[PDB]
Amino acid sequence: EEAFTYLCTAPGCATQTPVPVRLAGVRFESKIVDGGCFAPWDLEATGACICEIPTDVSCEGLGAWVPTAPCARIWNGTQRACTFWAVNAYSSGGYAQLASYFNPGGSYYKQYHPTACEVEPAFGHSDAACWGFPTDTVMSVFALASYVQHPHKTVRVKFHTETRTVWQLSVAGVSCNVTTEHPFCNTPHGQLEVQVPPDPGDLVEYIMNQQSRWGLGSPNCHGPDWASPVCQRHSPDCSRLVGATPERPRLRLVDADDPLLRTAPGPGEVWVTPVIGSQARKCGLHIRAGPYGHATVEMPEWIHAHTTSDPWHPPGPLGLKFKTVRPVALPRALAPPRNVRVTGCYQCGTPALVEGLAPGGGNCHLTVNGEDVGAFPPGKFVTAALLNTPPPYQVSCGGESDRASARVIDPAAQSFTGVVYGTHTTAVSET
Amino acid sequence: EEAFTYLCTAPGCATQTPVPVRLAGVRFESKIVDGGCFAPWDLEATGACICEIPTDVSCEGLGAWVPTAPCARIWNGTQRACTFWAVNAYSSGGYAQLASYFNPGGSYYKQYHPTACEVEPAFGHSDAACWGFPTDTVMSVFALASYVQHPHKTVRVKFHTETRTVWQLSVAGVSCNVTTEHPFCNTPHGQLEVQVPPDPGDLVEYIMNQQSRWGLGSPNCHGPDWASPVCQRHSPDCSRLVGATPERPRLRLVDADDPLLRTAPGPGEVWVTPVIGSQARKCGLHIRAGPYGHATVEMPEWIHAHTTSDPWHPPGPLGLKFKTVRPVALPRALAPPRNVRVTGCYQCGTPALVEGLAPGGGNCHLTVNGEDVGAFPPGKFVTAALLNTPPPYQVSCGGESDRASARVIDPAAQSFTGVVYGTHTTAVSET
Amino acid sequence: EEAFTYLCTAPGCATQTPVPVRLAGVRFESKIVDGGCFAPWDLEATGACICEIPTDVSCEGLGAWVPTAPCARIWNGTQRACTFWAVNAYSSGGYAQLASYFNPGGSYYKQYHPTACEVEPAFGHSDAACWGFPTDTVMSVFALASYVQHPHKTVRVKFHTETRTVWQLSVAGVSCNVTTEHPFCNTPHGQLEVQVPPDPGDLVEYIMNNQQSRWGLGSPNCHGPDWASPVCQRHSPDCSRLVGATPERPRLRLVDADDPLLRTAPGPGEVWVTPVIGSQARKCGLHIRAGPYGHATVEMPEWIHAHTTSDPWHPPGPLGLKFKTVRPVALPRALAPPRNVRVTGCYQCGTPALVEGLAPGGGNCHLTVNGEDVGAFPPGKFVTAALLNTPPPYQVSCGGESDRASARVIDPAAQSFTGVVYGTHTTAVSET
Ligand SMILES: *[C@@H]1O[C@H](CO)[C@@H](O)[C@H](O)[C@H]1NC(C)=O
Ligand SMILES: *[C@@H]1O[C@H](CO)[C@@H](O)[C@H](O)[C@H]1NC(C)=O
Ligand SMILES: *[C@@H]1O[C@H](CO)[C@@H](O)[C@H](O)[C@H]1NC(C)=O
Ligand SMILES: *[C@@H]1O[C@H](CO)[C@@H](O)[C@H](O)[C@H]1NC(C)=O
Ligand SMILES: *[C@@H]1O[C@H](CO)[C@H](O)[C@H](O)[C@H]1NC(C)=O
Ligand SMILES: [Ca+2]
Ligand SMILES: [Ca+2]
Ligand SMILES: [Ca+2]
Ligand SMILES: [Cl-]
């Protein structure tokens, strides 16, 4: 009574002989690796052309010239850079506003007018933008740039490893979920072995706030998916930044007729150009910024073109091998396992240690919150299992469950384990 | 008869019983991901030691001292950096050539002599290289560096995903191509099931221009293949640069006796040293450059040692399982599919959406330009398929073909989808 | 007499019907890719606040103020950066110690006092830290930073590709090592086909030193929780020379105690130095704030303990035991050694090496290169591309006696430097 038939993988696909088999659906199993939050590196810049020598180089102190909302937002950004250039200083009077106070680095100006920004002389640059001064022309330029994290551009990313396509079948109305790990279905006619195509490899789950979008791969940061937020800003706890980070933006004062404007600014470069005012004692500012990676990411557009609504699976078909063989039924232990300890992390990519005592009566088909971690003979057991569920852990051999003792941390905590975050401070003492 | 035999994977390998099976060849199937153009980061530098104070800091303006072809080529390079140092300026006369015009940043000089290059004073540096001046010694130094894309070093790269080794067999003269997805063959009066080793994982195809060279992996930029052009400069459309880019080169004027010369320059650093001239009012220049990645890539040499002429496959053997069973013949629809729409991209790594209507008379074994995308029951179908062929798309169920409606972009267009390329400009208005 | 049973993967797991099958152990096979040495990017900084204008800006020359051991260690580091700032110079006398010698870049000072460090004026910065001078207050600041490679933080890393879980079985007292490549076993009068789960994909072997191996599952993924892996950082293929991605030279800044910049944290690679007012006359302390690479300092024993396992990972199973009455067709095999065998390329590198020679007559040669299976070949000329895990010399066999092959095979470190010219690229521009 041995038979063979091909079963297609599309909805509606079904075989009739010798035993009717219907394709009920297609899903997937995996070992989740939660990377936390990802976002593009968004270089944002602001500033002002000022026909004055301001005494307070800050968003509040420059409120009369610098756009209020962009200043506050860019000031709170990552790798902030700001420069205040004195184009034409006070000829007389004032308070630490003469040209002499604008030495390279502006320490003389900073003594009387403290600021978190760099202060530089720019005497020699065109002061033509500031007109309508009968005796003393005054001109300064402010530029501010940082990598701003836009909430609408932030995505939660879960990497899917050890991916297994689940071919959900109905074998004469009896549910059977086949994978490369478990390709057999018990049938009274005899065992059914399903020949399945290989698994699709690693997947990328982009979580939008809740909808999931799918990527196939690591991702590949060297191919068409180079602009993926995964290839950019990484925050494991959706608060603190880790790993690769661009340098602080390079701010430059570039006059309108400077030959440098014939070329484009490089990544992280911000060029500011004073615009001649239509009004007396006023001027505009044109900003040219070189974005990270040579392009600005448009998140809804990137997600729509670089992801799918469902995870990818091979086209099939599935090879249905109907056999006359009847599997030997082994006696299973149904009592819960004892003294179970779970140590490590979950959804992290590092297998957690699961140890305990398997009871008598047969092999314990051990589950940790419903997750199959293998079968163990009666007695002490030790296993390294990749867990997808958080603590508390309910442990079972197939029957009743028991509460295991756990010392398990979350993926964000794992990302900060083995590292000391932040500024490293040291003091050199006098002899 | 129910029989088993091992078949080796080498040319000439063949088994005779119960039915002869000959290894006709070994090839591969994959889902192509075209990354476009890749090249190493080649830091190239030029310049000149000048016994004059030039008024035009450009390739044309410095034509009397700077080598012509290297200047023009390096000027057009990526992340260009250039500095003009005044070692010994005019003591009197001239036009914006006195020491006073060389303030830090050289804005006073630039006002009368515009240049895209940085201008800096260098008055405490040795002027010994410029001799033969009776009254006023004049000396300047020019340095120019960028990341030049050498055409002989540029490689077209296609990433191969979902790789399937194709074991081309001849079963009693009948062609059968076995993979992990399709391991069955028809024998005169039965069925052959071929046990195959796993697929080799992702491949890297280096396209020399036309010859193809093969890499096994992602590649791994952290191992012996670290210097792969894939790990470096990425241009998806073989014109515009994307992603990771080195900073602009750091140019330094370093005197012959400076202790800094006892150490090597870091990556992207360019040190220029004036060489005492054999002729009056003339001098040479010695350039020390720290290449990106601490080494200069020799492309024909790298390709020869880090790639193979053919894709890698496991050694085998193949397990030939001879069965008396015959597959159940299902009715196949031969009429072409109706209203087929193809949306997305090809050779991009994102599955394209294929939708239409499968005709009556059985399952439609759907092909998109000969590529198998699965079998579908009659009626409406929807599938996410990774396409290797460009539009137009010929769609078939196994018989006659029909032209499908398509909105499919190329891999280069996909790489620029979801991003806004180039300089981001913003204008700050006057109040 | 067709039979089926599930075999669990735990040590001691066994089935008795129809043929006794015992799980002896679990091992793995792979194609090794030796990456050499890996370590975190450790930004280390030192310096001193000096109530003097030193004439020798070096560790020895600044021995009276700069901590001796940190100076020497940081000076020998990667991407070294050092700056000497003149806060308050000599008002009169001295030797190239006046304010005029401290022009931007300090070339005038450097003419008489050479140094590998940057020299900068800092005359508008607070000199309050240096007191007890009746006539001429003198003050300078030195800062030194680099990426120091700590030996206790350096790990040897071998990447494992084409990984195959080895299920070691005892089939009716006979050893059988089942993999996805070789899933068949002989039973007394039949054949056992073992259904196995897929292989776990690539592995990362972290080697510390006596010598202990720790295991990672993956590439690794530098974008997830294992971002701080030394593999994601400093790479030295020959455990001597650095290659690839390298941070920029540290950015040293002299930052006064009341500067608003101190309300923010320094960025990666940034080093901010702040003079501390001395409790003694003509002396001052220095406070250093450094932004580590990757925003955190890696603690190696702690990272390894949490981000690795003692053994490589394998799926939970069970294994599907398919008992058949079938017997494999015995093909005649050549036992004589292969001749004129040449091996070219590299080993433990990730690039298949070329193996060519002459297989003898009288059957297929089941070729081994230092015990490694590279496939079976019919009599005569053969050519194969094989990933080798063993170094030269190469002993070649068809299953019987072995012969010495001729080899032109380089090690993984040599492969990493093949196709590249290491170090400084020099060029000369001639006079016209
Ligand atoms: C198959 O999967 C579905 C969905 O998870 C589940 O409801 C069903 O019980 C499973 N069947 C078996 C036999 O495990
Ligand atoms: C096997 O592949 C070859 C080469 O692509 C082709 O000519 C042949 O028709 C294929 N055979 C079958 C049965 O598909
Ligand atoms: C620094 O390097 C030199 C030269 O290799 C060596 O002589 C010296 O011992 C090293 N010092 C330290 C502390 O590593
Ligand atoms: C199985 O592996 C062990 C350990 O490597 C080895 O000693 C034994 O000979 C192997 N058995 C076979 C049949 O290859
Ligand atoms: C450019 O930026 C400035 C200041 O940040 C203004 O917001 C301006 O309106 C911007 N341009 C546009 C139209 O977005
Ligand atoms: Ca003025
Ligand atoms: Ca002169
Ligand atoms: Ca003094
Ligand atoms: Cl079978």
mmCIF file of N, CA and C in Angstrom, chain A residues 38 79-80 107 111 118 159 162 180-182 184 191 193 199 230 234 241 243 245 248 325 327-328 330 350 363 373-374 384 414-415 417-428 430-431, chain C residues 2 4 6 8 10 47 64 124 195 198 200 221 223-225 227 251 253 261 264-265 267 270 278-280 283 285-286 288 290 292 294-297 299 303 306-307 313 315-317 322:
data_model
loop_
_atom_site.group_PDB
_atom_site.id
_atom_site.type_symbol
_atom_site.label_atom_id
_atom_site.label_comp_id
_atom_site.label_asym_id
_atom_site.label_seq_id
_atom_site.Cartn_x
_atom_site.Cartn_y
_atom_site.Cartn_z
ATOM 1 N N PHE A 38 15.885 50.369 16.092
ATOM 2 C CA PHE A 38 16.739 50.758 14.974
ATOM 3 C C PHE A 38 16.121 51.949 14.263
ATOM 4 N N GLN A 79 25.459 63.334 18.960
ATOM 5 C CA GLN A 79 26.711 63.878 18.414
ATOM 6 C C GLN A 79 26.535 65.335 17.973
ATOM 7 N N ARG A 80 25.985 66.174 18.866
ATOM 8 C CA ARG A 80 25.738 67.586 18.588
ATOM 9 C C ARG A 80 27.024 68.356 18.293
ATOM 10 N N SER A 107 38.382 81.564 23.228
ATOM 11 C CA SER A 107 38.521 81.487 24.688
ATOM 12 C C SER A 107 38.336 82.837 25.394
ATOM 13 N N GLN A 111 35.269 83.485 28.127
ATOM 14 C CA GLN A 111 35.565 83.900 29.503
ATOM 15 C C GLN A 111 34.399 84.721 30.072
ATOM 16 N N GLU A 118 31.363 75.874 19.784
ATOM 17 C CA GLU A 118 32.684 76.341 19.387
ATOM 18 C C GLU A 118 32.547 77.798 18.943
ATOM 19 N N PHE A 159 15.388 39.573 14.876
ATOM 20 C CA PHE A 159 16.079 38.706 13.927
ATOM 21 C C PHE A 159 15.581 37.291 14.183
ATOM 22 N N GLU A 162 17.555 30.011 12.913
ATOM 23 C CA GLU A 162 17.127 28.596 12.931
ATOM 24 C C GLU A 162 15.676 28.474 12.437
ATOM 25 N N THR A 180 11.322 20.533 8.583
ATOM 26 C CA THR A 180 12.557 19.793 8.298
ATOM 27 C C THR A 180 12.979 18.983 9.543
ATOM 28 N N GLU A 181 12.600 19.463 10.745
ATOM 29 C CA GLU A 181 12.888 18.809 12.023
ATOM 30 C C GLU A 181 11.911 17.665 12.300
ATOM 31 N N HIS A 182 10.614 17.872 11.992
ATOM 32 C CA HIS A 182 9.542 16.902 12.243
ATOM 33 C C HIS A 182 8.715 16.673 10.960
ATOM 34 N N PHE A 184 7.221 13.805 9.808
ATOM 35 C CA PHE A 184 6.333 12.639 9.835
ATOM 36 C C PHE A 184 4.924 12.917 10.348
ATOM 37 N N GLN A 191 2.394 5.244 8.272
ATOM 38 C CA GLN A 191 3.140 6.502 8.393
ATOM 39 C C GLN A 191 3.295 7.287 7.084
ATOM 40 N N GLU A 193 5.529 10.290 5.405
ATOM 41 C CA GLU A 193 6.767 11.053 5.486
ATOM 42 C C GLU A 193 6.667 12.155 4.439
ATOM 43 N N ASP A 199 14.831 25.103 4.540
ATOM 44 C CA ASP A 199 14.342 26.281 5.242
ATOM 45 C C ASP A 199 14.896 27.559 4.582
ATOM 46 N N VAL A 230 18.592 48.799 10.353
ATOM 47 C CA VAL A 230 19.441 47.770 10.979
ATOM 48 C C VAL A 230 20.925 48.064 10.679
ATOM 49 N N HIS A 234 21.616 51.812 16.270
ATOM 50 C CA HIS A 234 21.185 50.679 17.095
ATOM 51 C C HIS A 234 21.050 51.053 18.574
ATOM 52 N N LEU A 241 22.264 54.364 22.919
ATOM 53 C CA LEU A 241 22.939 54.026 21.670
ATOM 54 C C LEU A 241 24.186 53.164 21.918
ATOM 55 N N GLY A 243 27.499 50.678 19.699
ATOM 56 C CA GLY A 243 28.259 50.394 18.488
ATOM 57 C C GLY A 243 28.622 51.581 17.624
ATOM 58 N N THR A 245 28.930 54.713 15.356
ATOM 59 C CA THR A 245 28.319 56.038 15.468
ATOM 60 C C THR A 245 29.079 57.014 14.567
ATOM 61 N N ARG A 248 31.075 63.733 15.048
ATOM 62 C CA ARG A 248 30.288 64.955 15.208
ATOM 63 C C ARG A 248 30.273 65.696 13.857
ATOM 64 N N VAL A 325 4.497 1.236 7.060
ATOM 65 C CA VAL A 325 5.156 1.195 8.369
ATOM 66 C C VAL A 325 4.333 1.843 9.499
ATOM 67 N N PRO A 327 4.930 3.245 13.350
ATOM 68 C CA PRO A 327 5.984 3.564 14.335
ATOM 69 C C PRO A 327 5.820 2.890 15.695
ATOM 70 N N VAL A 328 6.950 2.456 16.291
ATOM 71 C CA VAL A 328 6.993 1.787 17.595
ATOM 72 C C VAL A 328 6.696 2.827 18.685
ATOM 73 N N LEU A 330 6.753 4.386 22.091
ATOM 74 C CA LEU A 330 7.600 4.362 23.288
ATOM 75 C C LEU A 330 6.820 4.854 24.521
ATOM 76 N N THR A 350 21.866 33.543 22.533
ATOM 77 C CA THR A 350 22.770 32.714 23.332
ATOM 78 C C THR A 350 21.905 31.658 24.025
ATOM 79 N N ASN A 363 10.945 8.457 28.943
ATOM 80 C CA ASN A 363 11.642 9.687 28.567
ATOM 81 C C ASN A 363 10.749 10.904 28.726
ATOM 82 N N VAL A 373 12.359 21.411 24.034
ATOM 83 C CA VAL A 373 13.804 21.513 24.273
ATOM 84 C C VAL A 373 14.516 20.141 24.231
ATOM 85 N N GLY A 374 13.784 19.111 23.810
ATOM 86 C CA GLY A 374 14.288 17.748 23.676
ATOM 87 C C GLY A 374 13.716 16.776 24.684
ATOM 88 N N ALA A 384 21.324 23.084 26.609
ATOM 89 C CA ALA A 384 21.519 24.463 26.182
ATOM 90 C C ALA A 384 20.432 24.731 25.148
ATOM 91 N N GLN A 414 20.825 41.723 28.140
ATOM 92 C CA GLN A 414 21.897 40.916 27.544
ATOM 93 C C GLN A 414 22.855 41.791 26.730
ATOM 94 N N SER A 415 22.300 42.740 25.954
ATOM 95 C CA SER A 415 23.058 43.679 25.122
ATOM 96 C C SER A 415 23.989 44.573 25.951
ATOM 97 N N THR A 417 25.173 43.456 29.033
ATOM 98 C CA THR A 417 25.928 42.531 29.885
ATOM 99 C C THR A 417 27.313 42.315 29.269
ATOM 100 N N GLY A 418 28.345 42.439 30.099
ATOM 101 C CA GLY A 418 29.733 42.299 29.679
ATOM 102 C C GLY A 418 30.348 43.608 29.230
ATOM 103 N N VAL A 419 29.616 44.723 29.440
ATOM 104 C CA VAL A 419 30.051 46.084 29.120
ATOM 105 C C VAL A 419 29.718 47.062 30.256
ATOM 106 N N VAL A 420 30.527 48.130 30.386
ATOM 107 C CA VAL A 420 30.316 49.230 31.328
ATOM 108 C C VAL A 420 29.978 50.431 30.437
ATOM 109 N N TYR A 421 28.707 50.853 30.455
ATOM 110 C CA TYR A 421 28.207 51.938 29.613
ATOM 111 C C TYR A 421 28.659 53.332 30.038
ATOM 112 N N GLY A 422 28.822 54.201 29.044
ATOM 113 C CA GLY A 422 29.107 55.615 29.225
ATOM 114 C C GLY A 422 30.548 56.036 29.364
ATOM 115 N N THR A 423 30.721 57.328 29.672
ATOM 116 C CA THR A 423 31.990 58.033 29.859
ATOM 117 C C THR A 423 32.910 57.311 30.842
ATOM 118 N N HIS A 424 34.177 57.140 30.444
ATOM 119 C CA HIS A 424 35.195 56.554 31.302
ATOM 120 C C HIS A 424 36.008 57.721 31.854
ATOM 121 N N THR A 425 35.942 57.927 33.174
ATOM 122 C CA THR A 425 36.644 59.033 33.825
ATOM 123 C C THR A 425 37.856 58.574 34.608
ATOM 124 N N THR A 426 38.924 59.380 34.563
ATOM 125 C CA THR A 426 40.165 59.141 35.292
ATOM 126 C C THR A 426 40.741 60.463 35.811
ATOM 127 N N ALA A 427 41.446 60.397 36.940
ATOM 128 C CA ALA A 427 42.057 61.568 37.545
ATOM 129 C C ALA A 427 43.562 61.380 37.687
ATOM 130 N N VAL A 428 44.329 62.374 37.223
ATOM 131 C CA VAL A 428 45.783 62.397 37.353
ATOM 132 C C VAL A 428 46.070 63.286 38.556
ATOM 133 N N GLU A 430 48.480 65.265 41.518
ATOM 134 C CA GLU A 430 49.708 66.066 41.618
ATOM 135 C C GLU A 430 50.751 65.191 42.330
ATOM 136 N N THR A 431 52.047 65.427 42.090
ATOM 137 C CA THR A 431 53.110 64.643 42.736
ATOM 138 C C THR A 431 53.365 65.127 44.165
ATOM 139 N N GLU C 2 9.986 -3.469 7.559
ATOM 140 C CA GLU C 2 10.184 -2.020 7.610
ATOM 141 C C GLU C 2 9.770 -1.573 9.020
ATOM 142 N N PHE C 4 10.060 1.822 12.187
ATOM 143 C CA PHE C 4 10.329 3.218 12.530
ATOM 144 C C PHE C 4 10.242 3.467 14.031
ATOM 145 N N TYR C 6 11.549 6.856 17.099
ATOM 146 C CA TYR C 6 12.185 8.135 17.396
ATOM 147 C C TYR C 6 13.266 7.917 18.443
ATOM 148 N N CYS C 8 15.763 9.972 21.048
ATOM 149 C CA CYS C 8 16.079 11.261 21.664
ATOM 150 C C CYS C 8 17.578 11.569 21.581
ATOM 151 N N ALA C 10 19.610 13.210 23.961
ATOM 152 C CA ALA C 10 20.302 13.327 25.245
ATOM 153 C C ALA C 10 21.284 12.166 25.460
ATOM 154 N N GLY C 47 47.668 61.975 30.924
ATOM 155 C CA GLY C 47 48.184 63.322 30.772
ATOM 156 C C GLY C 47 48.597 63.930 32.085
ATOM 157 N N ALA C 64 58.343 63.859 35.344
ATOM 158 C CA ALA C 64 58.112 64.550 36.616
ATOM 159 C C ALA C 64 56.620 64.840 36.887
ATOM 160 N N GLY C 124 43.954 81.814 26.568
ATOM 161 C CA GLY C 124 42.695 82.351 27.079
ATOM 162 C C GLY C 124 41.935 81.424 28.008
ATOM 163 N N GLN C 195 16.744 10.139 9.881
ATOM 164 C CA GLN C 195 16.174 11.443 9.570
ATOM 165 C C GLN C 195 16.733 12.373 10.648
ATOM 166 N N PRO C 198 17.844 20.017 10.511
ATOM 167 C CA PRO C 198 18.875 20.761 9.771
ATOM 168 C C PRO C 198 20.065 21.124 10.648
ATOM 169 N N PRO C 200 22.979 23.671 12.322
ATOM 170 C CA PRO C 200 22.697 24.956 12.989
ATOM 171 C C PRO C 200 23.186 26.231 12.298
ATOM 172 N N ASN C 221 26.186 38.401 14.685
ATOM 173 C CA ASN C 221 25.319 39.510 14.332
ATOM 174 C C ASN C 221 25.780 40.722 15.152
ATOM 175 N N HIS C 223 24.742 43.656 14.861
ATOM 176 C CA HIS C 223 23.597 44.557 14.987
ATOM 177 C C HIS C 223 22.614 44.158 16.102
ATOM 178 N N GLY C 224 22.869 43.045 16.787
ATOM 179 C CA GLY C 224 22.002 42.574 17.864
ATOM 180 C C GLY C 224 22.642 42.606 19.244
ATOM 181 N N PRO C 225 22.194 41.731 20.185
ATOM 182 C CA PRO C 225 22.771 41.727 21.544
ATOM 183 C C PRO C 225 24.263 41.414 21.654
ATOM 184 N N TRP C 227 26.594 42.795 19.799
ATOM 185 C CA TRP C 227 27.233 43.955 19.158
ATOM 186 C C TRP C 227 28.657 44.239 19.672
ATOM 187 N N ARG C 251 40.110 62.642 19.604
ATOM 188 C CA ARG C 251 40.007 64.100 19.550
ATOM 189 C C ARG C 251 40.206 64.680 20.946
ATOM 190 N N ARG C 253 40.694 67.567 23.697
ATOM 191 C CA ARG C 253 40.245 68.930 23.971
ATOM 192 C C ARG C 253 40.597 69.355 25.381
ATOM 193 N N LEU C 261 30.214 72.858 28.107
ATOM 194 C CA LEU C 261 30.422 71.601 27.376
ATOM 195 C C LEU C 261 30.433 70.391 28.333
ATOM 196 N N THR C 264 27.452 67.967 29.036
ATOM 197 C CA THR C 264 27.225 66.884 28.077
ATOM 198 C C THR C 264 28.360 65.861 28.179
ATOM 199 N N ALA C 265 28.124 64.651 27.666
ATOM 200 C CA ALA C 265 29.103 63.572 27.673
ATOM 201 C C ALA C 265 29.957 63.608 26.398
ATOM 202 N N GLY C 267 31.721 62.335 23.010
ATOM 203 C CA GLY C 267 31.349 61.348 22.005
ATOM 204 C C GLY C 267 32.384 60.247 21.877
ATOM 205 N N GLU C 270 36.368 60.814 21.807
ATOM 206 C CA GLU C 270 36.659 62.155 22.320
ATOM 207 C C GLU C 270 37.248 62.076 23.716
ATOM 208 N N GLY C 278 45.468 72.871 42.302
ATOM 209 C CA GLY C 278 46.376 72.190 43.213
ATOM 210 C C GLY C 278 46.234 72.590 44.666
ATOM 211 N N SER C 279 46.468 71.621 45.566
ATOM 212 C CA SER C 279 46.454 71.820 47.015
ATOM 213 C C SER C 279 47.830 72.347 47.445
ATOM 214 N N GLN C 280 48.845 72.132 46.585
ATOM 215 C CA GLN C 280 50.239 72.551 46.750
ATOM 216 C C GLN C 280 50.572 73.638 45.723
ATOM 217 N N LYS C 283 51.797 73.201 41.441
ATOM 218 C CA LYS C 283 51.315 71.851 41.134
ATOM 219 C C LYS C 283 49.815 71.868 40.859
ATOM 220 N N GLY C 285 46.335 69.011 39.361
ATOM 221 C CA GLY C 285 45.814 67.721 38.934
ATOM 222 C C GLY C 285 45.108 67.820 37.598
ATOM 223 N N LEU C 286 44.740 66.673 37.025
ATOM 224 C CA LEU C 286 44.039 66.654 35.749
ATOM 225 C C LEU C 286 42.889 65.661 35.772
ATOM 226 N N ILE C 288 40.165 63.648 33.501
ATOM 227 C CA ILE C 288 39.998 63.182 32.123
ATOM 228 C C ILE C 288 38.646 62.502 31.912
ATOM 229 N N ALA C 290 36.644 60.502 28.908
ATOM 230 C CA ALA C 290 36.797 59.844 27.611
ATOM 231 C C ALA C 290 35.532 59.112 27.186
ATOM 232 N N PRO C 292 34.178 56.167 25.265
ATOM 233 C CA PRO C 292 34.673 54.918 24.659
ATOM 234 C C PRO C 292 34.048 54.599 23.310
ATOM 235 N N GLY C 294 31.992 52.657 20.690
ATOM 236 C CA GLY C 294 30.773 51.866 20.824
ATOM 237 C C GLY C 294 29.919 52.219 22.025
ATOM 238 N N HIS C 295 30.252 53.344 22.713
ATOM 239 C CA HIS C 295 29.552 53.905 23.884
ATOM 240 C C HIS C 295 29.693 53.102 25.193
ATOM 241 N N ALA C 296 30.544 52.057 25.201
ATOM 242 C CA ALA C 296 30.763 51.218 26.381
ATOM 243 C C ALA C 296 32.128 50.539 26.381
ATOM 244 N N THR C 297 32.655 50.246 27.583
ATOM 245 C CA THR C 297 33.929 49.555 27.784
ATOM 246 C C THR C 297 33.623 48.063 27.972
ATOM 247 N N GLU C 299 34.072 44.300 29.147
ATOM 248 C CA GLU C 299 34.645 43.512 30.238
ATOM 249 C C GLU C 299 34.658 42.089 29.689
ATOM 250 N N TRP C 303 31.715 39.337 29.328
ATOM 251 C CA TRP C 303 31.083 39.253 28.007
ATOM 252 C C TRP C 303 31.040 37.805 27.530
ATOM 253 N N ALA C 306 28.458 35.454 29.438
ATOM 254 C CA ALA C 306 27.053 35.690 29.098
ATOM 255 C C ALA C 306 26.701 35.522 27.616
ATOM 256 N N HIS C 307 27.648 35.801 26.708
ATOM 257 C CA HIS C 307 27.393 35.759 25.264
ATOM 258 C C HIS C 307 27.867 34.493 24.545
ATOM 259 N N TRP C 313 25.924 24.720 19.840
ATOM 260 C CA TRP C 313 24.490 24.432 19.883
ATOM 261 C C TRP C 313 24.074 23.455 18.781
ATOM 262 N N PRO C 315 20.098 21.360 17.363
ATOM 263 C CA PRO C 315 18.639 21.290 17.593
ATOM 264 C C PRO C 315 18.220 20.200 18.601
ATOM 265 N N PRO C 316 17.027 20.308 19.231
ATOM 266 C CA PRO C 316 16.642 19.317 20.255
ATOM 267 C C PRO C 316 16.335 17.890 19.793
ATOM 268 N N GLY C 317 16.096 17.702 18.499
ATOM 269 C CA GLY C 317 15.726 16.403 17.950
ATOM 270 C C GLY C 317 14.227 16.160 18.068
ATOM 271 N N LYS C 322 14.721 5.075 10.510
ATOM 272 C CA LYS C 322 14.017 4.341 9.455
ATOM 273 C C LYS C 322 14.776 3.048 9.148
#
